[PDB]
Each structure stands twice: as C-alpha cells, then as structure tokens.
C-alpha cells in the first residue's frame, strides 16, 4: 500500500526548481532564468493591444522538437504549432554549455512563413545556425528561408543570454506599436542589454 498521489501531475518541464541559483553580474544565464523573465513579461503585456499575437516558448520544449521519442516531439509541436497558438513565436536556441541565440517564427501568412535568427557572437559558429535549422525543420518550415538578422555584437563572454532576452522584449514592444512591420522593423542592431535591469525583473517577479 502507501498510495502515491498522481491526480494531475505537471509535465516535467513545468516542475519548479527551488534550488535555481540566483543570477549575478558575470554568470551565464540558465533556462530557468530565461523562463522566469518571459513569464513576467507575458504578464506585463497582458491586456495590451496585439499582445495576443505573442508566444514565448520554453527552451526545454525547443529541444524536445528534436527528441528521438515521437510522442515527445509531437507534444512540442502541439505546444508551438497549433491552431490556438499565437502566430509570432520566440524560440530560444541553446548550444549546450556554450551559447544562446534567438529564432523568431511569424505565421500570420500561412502560405509564406518568415523566420529570423539573431546571433550576437562576433565570429559565428556554423553549429548555432544548424540548431536553428533543426527547430524550423521540425516546425514544418524550409530552413533555407530563415534570415540571418543583425543584432548587437556581445563584448564579453557571458551576455549572450542578455541579448536574447533584450531582443525578445524589444521586438514584443514593436508588435504592440506596429513598428515590427516597418522597414527595418526586425532589426536589432542598436539594442543595449542591461544585466542590472534583468536582475531587477527576476527579483520583483
């Protein structure tokens, strides 16, 4: 006996991590940090016009798209590419224990889907675009059509996560203003990430 409660368990990626280390001035960002930031952002945009078009994807779900288990990758596609899923999706792309980069997919036009990849590294790694291609491939897109877009070049070896979070926040406010669609609307050449503001968001959330 000694019955164990299994009534309505969360999926593994939604289980909390109470031992999640705090972020500092020079540490690399973790996936738990990225999600805490986007969970708070989605809350700050709630009720604003056009906020219903955005969806910030969990990085763990981005990796499940390439899972060898077919049930897992099907769950990821239901979470990222369904009829009730917002058409503008932000996918964090992780090179394990190395780098972070951003991939955006816009599905407003179902007969022509646009994809944008942002990589803040000075000399780009072919392996990073490869992982962005796998994500688009598993989302039913042609990876050859993904655009390699401009973003501010990191001047340290730890703020690639900051560039990802800042680009997500900056672009989201452009969807709210309607400037996302102007010429150069998806250009992030002039962003300036702020470690202190990011730490502030995580504290007061």
């Amino acid at each position: 006996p000694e019955r164990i409660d299994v009534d309505n368990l969360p999926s593994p990626q939604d289980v909390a991590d109470p031992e999640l280390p705090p972020v500092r001035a020079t540490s690399w960002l973790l996936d738990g940090h990225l999600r805490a930031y986007t969970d708070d952002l989605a809350r700050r945009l709630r009720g604003e016009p056009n906020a219903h078009l955005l969806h910030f994807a969990d990085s763990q779900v981005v990796t499940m798209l390439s899972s060898a288990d077919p049930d897992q990758q099907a769950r990821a596609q239901r979470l990222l590419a369904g009829d009730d899923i917002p058409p503008i999706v932000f996918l964090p792309i992780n090179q394990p224990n190395a780098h972070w980069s951003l991939l955006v997919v816009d599905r407003r036009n179902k007969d022509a889907v646009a994809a944008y990849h942002y990589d803040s590294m000075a000399q780009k790694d072919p392996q990073q675009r490869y992982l962005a291609d796998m994500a688009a491939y598993h989302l039913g897109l042609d990876y050859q059509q993904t655009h390699e877009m401009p973003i501010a070049i990191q001047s340290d070896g730890y703020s690639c996560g900051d560039h990802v979070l800042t680009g997500i926040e900056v672009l989201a406010h452009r969807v709210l203003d309607g400037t996302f669609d102007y010429a150069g609307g998806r250009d992030l050449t002039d962003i300036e990430p702020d470690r202190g503001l990011i730490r502030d968001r995580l504290a007061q959330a």
Binding site: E2, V6, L9, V15, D17, T63, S67, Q72, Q95, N97
Partner: protein
C-alpha cells in the same frame, strides 16, 4: 533493483540502484554513464523534484520505476 531515467530528447538511462541509495548518489551514477555533472541534473518523480539528502525509499520509489531527468541549460 533497476530504475529508468528519461530525458527530454528521448533517451532512457537505466541504473542498478538500491532503495537505501541517496539522491546525490544516483546522480553520480548518471554522471558516470553520461558525463553530466550533478550540478546540472534535476531528477523528477511523480511531478516532484527530489532533494539530494533524501533516499530513494523516502520517495516510495520501487523497482523498475521511471524518473525524469531535466537539465539546467546554460550559455
């Protein structure tokens, strides 16, 4: 007794553990088999995260149980 550990990329890791084994000890076995340091491993069972200082028996984990291994991704 043999337990199973499933990652989110579709890999199952099998282990030969004892009920008296600690959570930290199980993680070292996973390090031995896959090279992942224990500072990155998050073991999950019945939708709950396991504390390093408890035992497999404390969580009523029986033979052939399935655990989830979620990683702390960094960059």
């Amino acid at each position: 007794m043999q337990i199973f550990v499933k990652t989110l990329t579709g890999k199952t890791i099998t282990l030969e553990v004892e009920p008296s084994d600690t959570i930290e000890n199980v993680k070292a076995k996973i390090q031995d088999k896959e090279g992942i340091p224990p500072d990155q491993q998050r073991l999950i069972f019945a939708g709950k995260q396991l504390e390093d200082g408890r035992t497999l028996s404390d969580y009523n984990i029986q033979k052939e149980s399935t655990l989830h291994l979620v990683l702390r991704l960094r960059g």
